[PDB]
Amino acid sequence: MLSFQYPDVYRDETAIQDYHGHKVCDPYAWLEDPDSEQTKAFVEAQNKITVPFLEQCPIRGLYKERMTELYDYPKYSCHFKKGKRYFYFYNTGLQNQRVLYVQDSLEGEARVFLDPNILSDDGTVALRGYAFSEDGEYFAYGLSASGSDWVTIKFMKVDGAKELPDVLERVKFSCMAWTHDGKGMFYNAYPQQDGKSDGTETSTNLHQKLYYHVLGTDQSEDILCAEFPDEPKWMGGAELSDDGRYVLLSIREGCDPVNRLWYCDLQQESNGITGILKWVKLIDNFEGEYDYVTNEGTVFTFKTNRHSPNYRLINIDFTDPEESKWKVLVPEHEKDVLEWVACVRSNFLVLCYLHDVKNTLQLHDLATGALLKIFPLEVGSVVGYSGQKKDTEIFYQFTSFLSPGIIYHCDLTKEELEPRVFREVTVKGIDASDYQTVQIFYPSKDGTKIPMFIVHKKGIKLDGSHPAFLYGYGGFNISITPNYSVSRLIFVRHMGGVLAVANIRGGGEYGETWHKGGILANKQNCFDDFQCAAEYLIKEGYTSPKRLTINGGSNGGLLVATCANQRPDLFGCVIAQVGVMDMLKFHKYTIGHAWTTDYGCSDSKQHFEWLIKYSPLHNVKLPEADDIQYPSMLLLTADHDDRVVPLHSLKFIATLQYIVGRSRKQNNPLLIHVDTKAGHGAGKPTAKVIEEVSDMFAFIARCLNIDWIP
């Protein structure tokens, strides 16, 4: 099967760094430079062996044909109203990018408003962020090229879809918020830096500033409204209150769900927005999250995790601001996580809870917090919503493992609420009724019960014979909830597979305590939970080690890489997408400094001692047992991934190939693929999505010798 040679890769044996008395060698440190001829050559030499391996088997073509057919169904976002018009995104099925449409009423003819497909030949220019003026008459929108986090903001007049001259450069991790006077918009930008700013560069991102752009002016005239030059990692995002009176500034430092909250009453500005605003530092620490919901005069309703790991709603009066005086509007639930909250039709709140990793959607009274209405849902996720304070209706979008999902609509002006299906799409070719989704709770190493979803064909014998695809993330307070994936259902239907998703610690599935259970000194809990998930699938007879594939991306790419080093005997195949592999250096690059809230930072001795134990780059080791080799591994990354710089995967693959790939007992392939004109994955065009899943499943089919099932 290894009908190919690994490329020779130079080792810089002089690259030795002292970490708190521990010497670490980093012989592929030179791969950190994306622009060098050396690094370019390495990448070319790697893709040269990977592409033929993946494309040799007819199963890739069979999978791609099926994916192309089954993925070709219409995809809609919720309707949402702005000013006097409705908007929605729509993809006929296989367009590279979804298209923004406008209609003058709910039954009016729709027309194309913004079509990102015409911005490139290959669909690699995508929308990233947008903001309508309060009256709905002007529209600002971010564009990213090649999947980079860098954005250019452009502007349109809505009536006639007219392009405006205004262009904002150097935008990244940015808010977009228009003042209600329609004069201009808040956004964030970064100071000029040496070298490139296109998504191929690794330079750290510091000193983000908040600016106000006056419409019809050049960007050079933009007003600096907030900056934190003594705190280079702080990021201040602006939003206007629902009545337009206040700018709220949420300042973050890292990825924890906490923020400072300052405000500025715009009516108190001496002469409009002319420089740094008269900020009032209502919450001036990083001890809690304060997420604006709505206000009524000086009474501000926020969703918070302050003293409430499962979140709750509080009212803070700006004119009586001490914490002792805050009113608890909707108290914390004992187990259910309050995921998000919206205010609609003046005095309703829409609350979305997570209960054992399934959503429930509720309407509450703003004045008392009282429950009014439960919106009926099947078991799965709410993935989209519209309805702001001035609106008199909501839309919401539901999805699940087996259903592409449904957009619902509810007219909130009605005395008796009657939600109805507004849009529904069926994917013929996959009969949902042939399959089932079960949820189980398995005990981890320390006895903690972890949820896991399993999706499989009804009636199968649990005799260990099925290939399985087990997915995890485990970090950053992100909950991994049910969603429709045609590519995974093809694995079930046409490869006879079992799908599994493990809700391991580090996630937000059981609130901030679940998140803290998988970070910092307890990061090893994530890996233990995930390994235990694999043992459960095997023990209960869903699969066997040699038929089990694991998959994760980003922080989940770290998950599956670590699990390969720690338990190579447990897995047949590992696909790590855009993974954080160098845990000693991740903080040095682009936005990596933000992840130290989950991981820690190697500059501290204490953190170093945690990180060195699991950092995938630093834990590649030939298994001691003669009959154990590493699983088949595929790393996927891309040259404009400026979220997780691709050097992580480059250094990791060189290391795997040299330490393990050179040993006589290793017969499983250890491969990387580096895509071009693509990034971390946000805004990836449909054509690339299809190619990527075809690569992934062809790898699986080949490594496990799975027969296609027509």
Ligand SMILES: *[C@](O)(CO)[C@@H]1CCCN1C(=O)[C@@H]1CCCN1C(=O)NCc1ccccc1
């Ligand atoms: C990956 O897991 C998910 O994309 C990477 C690697 C570890 C964590 N991330 C990651 O992207 C984190 C987690 C989700 C958001 N995030 C960011 O880095 N976001 C950029 C950002 C924006 C504002 C403030 C801080 C960070």
